[PDB]
């Protein structure tokens, strides 16, 4: 889609967002262990959050709209889930204790890379 979509994303694209907001961890590849800033995090939040409103399905937007409200919220990660990086992730990387994150899905929205990785135990 990229240009063909611009801002009016379809159920296919929004499906990717539903998974992102569903993720347990939300950080940036350039600095996964360190956040950016209060305005920075909110900035990226406005990007996707803006996609919801402009969306065609006002009902569906409500569901994700609330899921985004907790963007980058303090929660315990676990295997099977996924970590959404605001920058991306092409290679596998550790997250904590012994859990490693492997590249699962990379999508660019509003000119911002968004990679998701499955949380698997390094063994």
From Swiss-Prot:
Signal peptide: none annotated. Glycans are attached at residue 49. This is Non-structural protein 7-alpha. The gene is rep. The chain holds residues 1454 to 1575 of 3175 of the full protein.
């Amino acid at each position: 889609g990229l240009t063909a979509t611009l801002a009016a994303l379809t159920d296919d694209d929004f499906q990717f967002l539903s998974d992102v907001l569903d993720c347990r961890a939300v950080r940036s590849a350039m600095n996964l262990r360190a956040a950016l800033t209060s305005f920075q995090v909110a900035q990226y939040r406005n990007i996707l959050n803006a996609s919801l409103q402009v969306d065609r399905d006002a009902a569906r937007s409500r569901r994700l709209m609330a899921k985004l409200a907790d963007f980058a919220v303090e929660q315990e990660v676990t295997a099977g889930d996924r970590v959404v990086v605001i920058d991306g992730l092409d290679r596998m990387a550790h997250f904590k204790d012994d859990l490693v994150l492997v590249p699962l899905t990379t999508k660019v929205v509003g000119g911002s890379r968004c990679t998701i990785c499955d949380v698997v135990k390094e063994e």
